[PDB]
Design a protein around this ligand. Sequence first.
Ligand SMILES: Cc1c(C)n(Cc2ccc(-c3ccccc3C(=O)O)cc2)c2ccc(C(=O)N[C@@H](C)c3ccc([N+](=O)[O-])cc3)cc12
Ligand SMILES: Cc1c(C)n(Cc2ccc(-c3ccccc3C(=O)O)cc2)c2ccc(C(=O)N[C@@H](C)c3ccc([N+](=O)[O-])cc3)cc12
Lengths: 257, 260
Amino acid sequence: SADLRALAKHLYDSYIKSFPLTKAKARAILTGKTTDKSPFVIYDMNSLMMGEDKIKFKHITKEVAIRIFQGCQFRSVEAVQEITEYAKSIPGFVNLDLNDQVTLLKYGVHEIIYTMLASLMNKDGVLISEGQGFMTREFLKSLRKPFGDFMEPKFEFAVKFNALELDDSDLAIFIAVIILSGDRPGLLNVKPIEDIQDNLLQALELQLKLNHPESSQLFAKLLQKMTDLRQIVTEHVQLLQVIKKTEHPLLQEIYKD
Amino acid sequence: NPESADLRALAKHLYDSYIKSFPLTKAKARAILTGTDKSPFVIYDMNSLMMGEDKIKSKEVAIRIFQGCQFRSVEAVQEITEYAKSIPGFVNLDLNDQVTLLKYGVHEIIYTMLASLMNKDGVLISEGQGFMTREFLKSLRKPFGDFMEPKFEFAVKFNALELDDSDLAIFIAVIILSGDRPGLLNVKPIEDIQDNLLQALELQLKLNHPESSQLFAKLLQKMTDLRQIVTEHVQLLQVIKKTETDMSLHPLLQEIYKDL
Ligand SMILES: Cc1c(C)n(Cc2ccc(-c3ccccc3C(=O)O)cc2)c2ccc(C(=O)N[C@@H](C)c3ccc([N+](=O)[O-])cc3)cc12
Ligand SMILES: Cc1c(C)n(Cc2ccc(-c3ccccc3C(=O)O)cc2)c2ccc(C(=O)N[C@@H](C)c3ccc([N+](=O)[O-])cc3)cc12
């Protein structure tokens, strides 16, 4: 193995083709090492409006919090399809029982979305609209209850996770590992899922020992970050359908997932 | 390797202090459950319970069971404190952070070790002298009937990993040194110790079990299930507090639940 490297390469390539905005580009934009385009900054309501007028977002279908929230829903639905297409390229995935494919995606897309979301975040805000914009953290937190603490856990997590300084080639395999979780509810055949995940974990371990030679504890710290991820999801659910306080039907049908 | 040797030394140290801290190990529990040790008297209904009191172990069943769990929880906290102090670096931390780490760690550790006393049919009681069935515990009047069931649910899943005491020692050490506890002052020393503990556990599982990295991942993942049952427990506790007002909660446990 000899194969963990091949698998790493394949997953990296697939990752590049599946996700338009990589962490490398995102960091280039956030630091400003290339500029080349400073992102349109949204820090309050007027800049939000002006941004809506300039960029003309595709999800604009009339209250700030609601609009931001629905933008998040739209981007999330795009992300799900990107992640699905990436999942299909994981060696062995399409050979799994179709039910299990659907289950794995259904229960993994959240964790993966937050993982990749960390790539678009620093301690001060998040890249928005394909990287064309940047929304401040303070503006997100200043939204009315309950939307005030919607984005915050993702920011906490993103800070602590970005402290690990993973690059795209690490993240590809990390995401692959997350997808192939054998403890999703309602799985019919766990064995191949965990065999594949075993191979993926080995690939990840090697990839980390090679890409990050200075640190021997990174693997354990990452695997530990997975649980952080899952509880971020757990808490997010609790905050999520507590937003059934809201109100249409066809749109809600699009986002009923 | 040298680093490997360090990790092994840490593992042996932790297992040693684990054996010295906890009088009821998983090895003894399994020796009792699977017929070296005496066989337990089994309580599975009211009659066998009343006989069980004489065989031997205000008297309302659900309440008395609740209080028993409480007593054993106080003892467990004392044992866990003693163990925590044996973890290298712990006693050198800020005192407030020691208190915080214990405060948020004891529940997760207690349920972790409780799994060792459980099978899908029930749980050892009275230092392994007894065995109370899962269904008898479910049959307790509301709301005490739902007290133990989540712990059983977790216990089955967790026991499926087939860990032994030498694994558990490092795992609970990892749990204690959690850097994401609310209200910590110095996170970095804590996470520094925990990283070492995580490496020690990874190597331990590597030497003691197959597909060790996957086992490592699953085990680490169990902490989600753990925090889940802690949450459910606290909620049930709120209910009980409201409907059973003549009931004492031990001051120590109160300190633990205060502004959790
Ligand atoms: C995929 C994704 C992105 C790109 N962002 C940042 C973002 C995206 C869009 C905008 C934005 C805002 C206003 C105007 C334009 C834009 C813009 O950038 O286009 C800002 C930041 C997210 C923020 C949160 C979540 C999330 O917590 N949960 C998902 C699974 C979910 C999300 C929602 C629900 N839900 O309750 O329906 C369930 C799960 C997901 C995402
Ligand atoms: C430490 C512990 C043990 C050994 N058992 C099994 C047991 C223990 C005692 C008995 C028993 C029953 C009757 C007579 C004698 C015994 C006996 O063996 O001694 C049977 C099984 C437990 C069961 C539940 C909990 C729990 O859910 N939460 C803790 C933090 C807690 C537990 C309780 C409370 N509380 O509010 O009371 C707060 C937190 C903890 C424990």
